[PDB]
Design a protein around this ligand. Structure first.
Ligand SMILES: Fc1ccc(NC2CCOCC2)nc1
Ligand SMILES: Fc1ccc(NC2CCOCC2)nc1
Lengths: 263, 265
């Protein structure tokens, strides 16, 4: 991979692997989500980071608040997908990371994604606004004019998500992470929550539809010793409302929505 | 990736990804195992098995893993390039073998090696069977004719018999179940998931203070997408050795047995 000519964005090419595809021989949305985090990580490394010097001094880290992905075509096993990524400040609210996915052979846009990140103290887990000190440290690596993967006014990436009401239409209970679900810092990888959300969608929907859009809000982290319940209700194309909560006390960890198109 | 000059083996380079590494910032043994299956798949495709032969498709036969044996000297770090070479060899009518050698791309040093035994099985009845002369002749033209072994040694750990763990187990992880990411393109549980499940019953303190050097896993029965598994481990031993057993949560039907060898960091 490499930074682009202006040094304000980053591109990387990936060849879709045999174990990365589902039963239609195309990349799963979890493989796509892993590729998004890998290209994001390579972008941060390329510009010297993903915490700044002031963030390290104050024990602050970036945490995902929201992930939104729209796929038009899933790349097939053996296909090359090119992913471009960039960051932008959202004032003191936090930061945003966007991605564009393209078919390497045709140059056609096959997907797009956007994510909202908030600053959090590593130890107390207290959310915070971004200080002007940290904003100045990453502004030199971001486009100055707004650049959006989802520019449209009133688009799906900014819609409020309601809380699923019991009883859920579908459920998958007792989900728990194994060591492969953890990241290098021993926290549950953000992509695992995408998998857990999808576990409560009936297999018949998966067999007859393709996932077009997924919006996921992250409220609380699942610990390596926690147990999760995945809940889904049809709200409709087929649309669903999702809720992930702790198996015991019912504490919310995520809420989301999915939109599926008939094959 | 590409077939080598003689067309009897295949090589491919991989850059270790951020989500592929553990707490030491080096590739997990499950990432290594996924890379082994990917290079094996690319080798089959390169020689026209886009991995069953013509006779196998006619007779509804498939290759299934009977045993996987991996030894790692150095796990590649996040961002490192690892080169993997793979080849196949017939083992008469018993089945086939696939071997791998892992190297550090920069130094050319061997950092790991693996070997696997595969048996023929009817896709529908699940009945194991011997390799016919016709099947053997269809893949012999893609294998080295002289024996080529990743574990040539006359007393290697890749061929040792594994006993069945006796209850009570010293350690256990119960109620393990696959999610959609654990399935392969044919909706079967990926062979690498069983490696993860075996490792779930090793205490975290061993993982934090030791590095996994060797893993030998026997595959007896497959876990369905709706089955539930229990992972059992007992210490048998600076080095620490363990005996492992995976069995169905309900009736206790064995799905895998294995051994691991760990060295102190
Ligand atoms: F845009 C991103 C997305 C993820 C990331 N880093 C995490 C993903 C890999 O292991 C843990 C750290 N950085 C930037
Ligand atoms: F050498 C090998 C190893 C595994 C494999 N099987 C593949 C079946 C589809 O999912 C990816 C793995 N083929 C060849």
């Amino acid at each position: 991979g490499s930074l682009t000519e202006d040094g304000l964005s980053y591109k990387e090419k990936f060849v879709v692997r045999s174990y990365e595809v589902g039963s239609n021989k195309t990349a799963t949305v979890e493989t796509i989500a892993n590729l998004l985090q890998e290209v994001g990580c390579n972008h941060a490394q390329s510009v010297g980071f993903a915490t700044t010097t002031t963030m390290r001094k104050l024990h602050l880290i970036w945490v995902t608040a929201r992930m939104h992905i729209e796929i038009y075509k899933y790349p097939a096993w053996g296909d090359v997908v090119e992913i471009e990524t960039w960051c932008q400040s959202e004032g003191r609210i936090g930061t945003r990371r966007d991605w564009i996915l393209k078919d390497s052979v045709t140059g056609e846009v096959t997907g797009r994604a956007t994510s909202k990140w908030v600053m959090m103290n590593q130890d107390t887990r207290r959310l915070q606004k971004v200080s002007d000190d940290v904003r100045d440290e990453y502004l030199v690596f971001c486009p100055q004019e707004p650049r959006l993967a989802f520019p449209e006014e009133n688009n799906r990436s900014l819609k409020k998500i309601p809380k699923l009401e019991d009883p859920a239409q579908y459920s998958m209970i007792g989900l728990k992470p194994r060591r492969a679900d953890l990241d290098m810092n021993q926290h549950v990888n953000n992509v695992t929550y995408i998998g857990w959300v999808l576990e409560s969608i009936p297999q018949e929907i998966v067999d007859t539809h393709e996932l077009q859009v997924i919006t996921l809000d992250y409220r609380r982290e699942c610990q390596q010793d926690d147990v999760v319940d995945s809940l889904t209700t049809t709200t409709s194309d087929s649309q669903f409302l999702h809720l992930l909560r702790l198996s015991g006390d019912g504490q919310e960890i995520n809420r989301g929505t999915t939109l599926w198109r008939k094959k």
